[PDB]
Amino acid sequence: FLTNTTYDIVNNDTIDVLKMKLRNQGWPFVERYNAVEIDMSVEPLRSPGQ
Amino acid sequence: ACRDKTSANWRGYSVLVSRYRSLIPNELFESLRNISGEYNINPQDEHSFF
Numbered sequence: 001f002l003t004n005t006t007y008d009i010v011n012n013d014t015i016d017v018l019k020m021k022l023r024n025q026g027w028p029f030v031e032r033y034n035a036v037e038i039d040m041s042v043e044p045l046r047s048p049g050q
Numbered sequence: 051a052c053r054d055k056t057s058a059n060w061r062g063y064s065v066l067v068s069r070y071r072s073l074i075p076n077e078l079f080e081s082l083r084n085i086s087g088e089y090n091i092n093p094q095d096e097h098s099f100f
Contacts, residue, residue, distance in 0.1 A: 006057045 002027055052100040 003025050010018065019030040044050065071079075 006054055008057050 055100060 003021055005021075010021075013021070022030050
């Protein structure tokens with residue numbers, strides 16, 4: 001959509017190649033983000049000492 | 051728009067052409083010509099086709 005190309009052209013391109021194409025055009029949202037883990041206050045059920 | 055449609059749908063037309071090519075011999079392949087000019091495409095039909 002953004003770079004005006006077809007699915008057949010981008011079929012063989014890898015993640016690193018695709019990230020460069022969008023970044024050159026000015027699109028910065030090309031990265032996944034890891035969620036932050038939060039610990040439970042109590043021990044989970046059926047999970048002794050965990 | 052025309053580039054995208056041709057990229058997606060060329061395989062179906064390639065199979066269709068090959069099927070009808072098997073009907074004609076090599077002599078008819080290299081000899082027949084559009085001498086009369088009956089099959090002429092209207093401009094409105096061409097741009098609506100793609």
